[model samples]
Target: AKACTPLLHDCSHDRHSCCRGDMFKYVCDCFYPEGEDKTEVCSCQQPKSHKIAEKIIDKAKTTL
Candidate 1:
């Protein structure tokens, strides 16, 4: 699953680039690219993000 962010916002630090990086679990975070403050950026995601959640579920199922 793919997602797009056509809008770019400057967080008072670095000018935004492409969708930075991907995270794994719910606790994982995607940080702003370059030296921008994290609070200045919005956290967003794609459907593929659910894969980690699903993997956890499957692990629990196998263990049970």
Candidate 2:
């Protein structure tokens, strides 16, 4: 039973890499983290990125 990433990416039968890291339940999965490369939690091998809500890109004002 995986935590939150690609549902059941923890399954050894399907992962393209190793499932050797121990991660927390609430500490966002490799897929949903701010940094895409969370190898400490889960290998960066084909990690799924969560949906990006790009609503602040245009709203952000550059005062510099």
Please give the CA lDDT of all the candidate structures: 0.37, 0.40
Q: For residues 1-64, what per-residue lDDT tens digits would candidate 1 score against the true structure?
A: 1543323322222234334545432122256567475443444333453454433433344443
Runs of candidate 1 with Cα error greater than 4 angstroms are 1-30, 36-40, 49-64
lDDT of model number 1: 0.37
Per-residue C-alpha lDDT of model 2 across residues 19-48, encoded as one tens digit per residue: 334452212233444655653334324343
How many angstroms is residue 36 displaced in model 1 relative to the true structure, after the best TM-score fit? 4.4
Q: Which candidate's lDDT is highest?
A: 2
Candidate 2 positional error at 32, Å: 26
